[PDB]
Design a protein around this ligand. Structure first.
Ligand SMILES: [Zn+2]
Ligand SMILES: [Zn+2]
Length: 810
């Protein structure tokens, strides 16, 4: 037991009891505990004296609970000589002491730190020295503004296990990841801002250290910090985000400190690294591993669809794999049904969360599932740790289990509340203090030591993606090609090919339209994917699981149980029928031209809106409603959706432009894209052109509006280009069709990129293989050699036309 003075507080007190006897000057008064009311009591008379004001009772009342910790010794000050009448002022000099019981249930611990922190403020002792896009960029401007992060050592793995060449920055991130996991064996060679340093008074060592966030005190300077294996690797996409992480697993693939521990002589998978990855990147991580791993001894395997029967025994067995990749939807699925096969009865050696910002909503089952995973070392690969809210970082901290910020009460007290009340400058300093030793963020805009940017960003990158038509599209393209080949034989047999020059371009145009979509020549459903998910949810809620088997009544034949389940025909209004019974009704109602109504509720059920169950039934999700009649999508629209369904998880907030010369094609695109994509994650904008000037600028207004919770699409005509339209905010473009002149397509692409931007424009050109579109590219390559400009209007003009007509069929 020791004691030491720390400070004094002067305060007037209102008298409570009318003491008549004179009160000594240096009276050793005391504080008794019981809007708040604290009591004054003379130590020798054992009688109450007065009450303290509200602004002082709030400081003293919670400090009395920690008498062993903080002792308050009040002394009397002024001796007017008169008895304390009802209301006379009592002048006190409160002396404060910090006992060794303070020096070295979250609400119990926070109430103590808050009470002591309030005392230090009154003592006045100081140490020795939803989000908007504008508020979010101010956050990055600090958390990415580390003090010269360009001097991190470059660690190189031996090229017997890693067959890729790491960049300058990729070699640095590998060394930092090895340092975060305390893997010194693969490194050459080679405080706590939250803990501040106070000073001792000298009126009644010369320093002492304290952390007023947790209320902890220490004699010496405690440098103990960061008892965490791993961290968060934030980076702009393309800084070797995934490639660097694979370099870590190939460098250290198992717990080396544990193999010797068990060989010296269980639910520890001391050799397996779990990589939770979105399904859109499920096979890419498998591919990126094989493309990078050279050591055949360590193998990776995808865990999807319950392919591995017993995962618990397999991952701690004699030949467990070094990497296991699985979907968040697998973690979320097995977490709900209490699946005890694996993933929750083993402590994996390492866990890596690619695009880990998908657990930002801590209240969803997917987030609760990821935090429930046990591992020795944890990692978070995320290009955007914050999406739309500040507490999105909390789940990233709660996953890493960073004490005491993993506790929600510490976060809401020191981060959420000070931010939500305008004092954002402090909450940013608390966040930046706990994530500084854990997170490492770099930028393609950052410059190196030599004087070059980390990544040379070209203005654009155009890529031609060749597609092959469907089985039905080739027959239409062939039928239109046969008639196109005949109109050439007609004019050529008449002595002059150009006698059908207008008639041939019509057949060529119809060939161009077939490649885009077949509906551009002259039973389509009217239910989007968002509605099918809503109808499936309503359907599973109606026919809920119980003791007995599922039964489905037919509203026509009154059959209590329809068999088989594939013969179940479900209307737009979620009413069950026998598939033959419903078809007989529609055929009878169509042969007499009577409008179709539901035989159960008499509602306008459209024939294309008839639904059926998915065959087979996923036991983890239940019944799924798909269109009874099969829907068709053009090969290019099928390819575009395949790109967009990946950029959705590849990069949030990305604005994309879709080009097409056919105005009707853009109309079909909007209908198909909005139908097959979720509305809360993909926003589609179209440029009709005929709309008023204010609405067209209002569309571009909402399009430029950056939003990391969705991706935005702009469907404008290639014909008009983007003349007078600001398109700088776009990072990706899609050329759904080529044109005769290359200048019109190049000009539209060049209206996107502006020098001084942090992202290159990625362009993809969908060209149907061995089609007229592939021929039109060779025409553009001719116009890039000499131009649309031509000499001669007599013979040279006619001769030039003969070449292009032939090139389309060569
Ligand atoms: Zn029936
Ligand atoms: Zn009905």
């Amino acid at each position: 037991r020791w004691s030491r003075y720390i400070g004094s507080i002067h305060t007037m007190g209102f008298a409570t009891r009318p003491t008549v006897k004179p009160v000594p000057i240096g009276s050793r008064l005391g504080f008794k505990k019981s809007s708040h009311l604290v009591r004054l009591i003379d130590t020798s008379q054992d009688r109450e004296l007065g009450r303290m004001p509200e602004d002082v009772a709030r400081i003293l009342y919670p400090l009395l609970d920690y008498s062993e910790q903080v002792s308050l010794e009040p002394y009397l000050l002024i001796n007017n000589g008169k008895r304390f009448s009802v209301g006379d002022n009592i002048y006190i000099r409160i002396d404060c002491y910090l006992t060794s019981q303070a020096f070295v249930m979250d609400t119990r611990q926070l109430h103590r730190a808050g009470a002591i922190m309030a005392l230090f403020d009154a003592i006045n002792i100081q140490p020795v020295y939803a989000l908007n896009i504008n508020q979010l960029k101010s956050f990055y401007r600090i958390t990415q503004s580390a003090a010269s992060l360009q001097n991190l050592p470059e660690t190189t793995p031996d090229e017997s296990l890693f067959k890729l060449q790491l960049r300058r920055y990729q070699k640095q991130s590998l060394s930092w990841m090895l340092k975060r996991e305390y893997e010194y064996s693969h490194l050459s060679e080679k405080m706590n801002p939250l803990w501040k340093k106070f000073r001792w008074p000298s009126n009644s060592d010369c320093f002492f250290y304290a952390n007023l966030y947790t209320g902890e005190f220490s004699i010496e300077k405690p440098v103990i910090k960061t008892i965490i294996n791993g961290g968060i690797l934030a980076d702009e996409m393309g800084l070797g985000k995934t490639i660097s992480a694979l370099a870590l697993i190939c460098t250290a693939s198992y717990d080396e400190a544990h193999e010797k521990k068990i060989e010296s002589t269980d639910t520890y998978a001391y050799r397996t690294t779990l990589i939770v990855v979105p399904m859109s990147l499920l096979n890419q991580w498998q591919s990126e591993f094989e493309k990078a791993n050279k050591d055949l001894k360590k193998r990776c395997e995808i865990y999807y669809g319950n392919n591995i029967k017993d995962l618990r025994a397999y991952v701690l067995g004699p030949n467990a794999p070094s990497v296991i990749i699985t979907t968040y939807g697998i973690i979320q699925s097995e977490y709900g049904r209490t699946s005890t096969s694996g993933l929750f009865n083993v402590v994996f050696f390492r866990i890596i969360l690619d695009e880990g910002h998908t657990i930002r909503n801590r209240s969803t089952r997917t987030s609760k599932a990821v935090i429930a995973l046990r591992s020795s070392r944890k990692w978070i690969l995320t290009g955007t740790p914050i999406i739309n809210r500040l507490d999105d970082l909390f789940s990233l901290v709660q996953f890493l289990n960073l004490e005491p910020w993993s506790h929600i009460n510490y976060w809401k007290r020191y981060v959420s509340v000070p931010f939500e009340k305008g004092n954002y400058a402090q909450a940013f300093d608390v966040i930046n203090a706990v994530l500084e030793p854990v997170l490492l963020r770099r930028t393609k805009n950052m410059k190196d030591v030599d004087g070059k940017p980390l990544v040379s960003l070209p203005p654009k990158e155009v890529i031609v993606e060749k597609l092959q038509l469907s089985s039905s599209e080739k027959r239409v393209y062939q039928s239109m090609l046969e008639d196109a080949e005949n109109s050439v034989k007609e004019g050529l047999a008449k002595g002059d090919l150009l006698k059908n020059y207008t008639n041939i371009l019509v057949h060529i145009l119809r060939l161009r339209q077939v490649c885009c979509h077949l509906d551009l020549l002259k039973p389509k459903s009217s239910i989007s994917q968002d509605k099918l998910d809503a109808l499936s949810a309503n359907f599973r809620d109606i026919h809920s699981a119980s003791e007995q088997l599922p039964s489905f009544e037919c509203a026509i034949c009154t059959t209590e149980c329809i068999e088989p389940l594939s013969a179940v025909s479900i209307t737009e209004c979620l009413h069950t029928f026998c598939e033959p019974c419903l078809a007989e009704y529609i055929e009878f109602q169509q042969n007499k031209k009577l409008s179709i109504n539901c035989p159960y509720c008499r509602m306008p059920i459209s024939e294309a809106n008839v639904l059926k169950l998915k065959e087979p039934i996923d036991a983890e999700r239940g019944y799924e409603l798909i269109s009874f009649h099969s829907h068709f999508q053009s090969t290019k629209i099928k390819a575009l959706l395949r790109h967009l369904k990946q950029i959705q998880e590849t990069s949030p907030g990305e604005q994309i432009i879709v080009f097409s010369q056919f105005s009707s094609f853009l109309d079909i695109l909007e209908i198909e894209l909005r139908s097959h994509l979720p509305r809360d994650q993909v926003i589609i904008y179209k440029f009709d052109g005929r709309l008023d000037m204010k609405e067209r600028t209002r569309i571009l207004e909402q399009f430029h509006d950056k939003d990391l919770s969705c991706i935005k699409l702009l469907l404008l005509s290639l014909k008009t280009g983007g003349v007078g339209l600001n398109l700088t905010c776009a990072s990706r473009a899609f050329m759904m069709d080529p044109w005769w002149s290359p200048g019109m397509e190049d000009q539209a692409i060049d209206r996107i990129h502006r020098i001084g931007q942090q992202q290159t424009v990625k362009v993809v050109r969908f060209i149907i293989d061995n089609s007229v579109e592939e021929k039109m590219l060779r025409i553009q390559e001719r116009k890039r050699m000499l131009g649309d400009i031509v000499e001669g209007d007599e013979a040279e003009r006619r001769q030039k036309r003969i070449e292009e007509i032939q090139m389309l069929f060569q």
